[PDB]
Design a protein around this nucleic acid. Structure first.
Ligand SMILES: [Zn+2]
Ligand SMILES: [Zn+2]
Ligand SMILES: [Zn+2]
Ligand SMILES: [Zn+2]
Ligand SMILES: [Zn+2]
Length: 138
DNA sequence: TCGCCCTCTGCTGGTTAAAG
DNA sequence: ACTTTAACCAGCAGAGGGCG
């Protein structure tokens, strides 16, 4: 148990605590030699270098499209070649979304606070949430 | 042990097609 | 028959954990 003093992270390996702390300090030791990207750990630099090398190690076994990362391919297979996958229902409206991160986009765009407000395009009423604005305009 | 490799996670911007 | 818009999607970068 090697505990971070700054959060609840803990590990059974000293080296993992050292890596974790760079998330607080922002130290990025592993620099790309071709662009400005730099990583906190060795793996994400190698994964990034695949984009310079053109290395695409992953191939969809159904349609043979090729991918640079494994999770990209997995998501492609889930969304394009799989039926009856559970969908994301927004709690604040009736929209249904296929991907969790797209639900995130929707929450931030439609249900977040707009400090400077937005006026209806047909009337002088002002709203501070896009969903309420669009509902009013209708 | 720790470099290596896996996985789960999550934002961005181009495309597309639907609504009004 | 045109704009506006937001989900769909590939792409890329975030982290935590097992093990030879
Ligand atoms: Zn911490
Ligand atoms: Zn680079
Ligand atoms: Zn495929
Ligand atoms: Zn919603
Ligand atoms: Zn109005």
């Amino acid at each position: 148990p090697f505990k971070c003093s700054m959060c609840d992270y803990a590990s059974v390996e000293v080296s993992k605590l050292k890596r974790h702390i760079r998330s607080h300090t922002g130290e990025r030791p592993f620099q790309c030699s071709l662009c400005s990207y730099a990583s906190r750990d060795t793996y994400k630099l190698k994964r990034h270098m695949r984009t310079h090398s053109g290395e695409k190690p992953y191939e969809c076994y159904i349609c043979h499209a090729r991918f640079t990362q494994s999770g990209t391919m997995k998501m492609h297979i889930l969304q394009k070649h799989t039926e009856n996958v559970a969908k994301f229902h927004c709690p604040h409206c009736d929209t249904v979304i296929a991907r969790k991160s797209d639900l995130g986009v929707h929450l931030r765009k439609q249900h977040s606070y707009i400090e400077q407000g937005k006026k209806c395009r047909y009337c002088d009423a002002v709203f501070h949430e896009r969903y309420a604005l669009i509902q009013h305009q209708k």
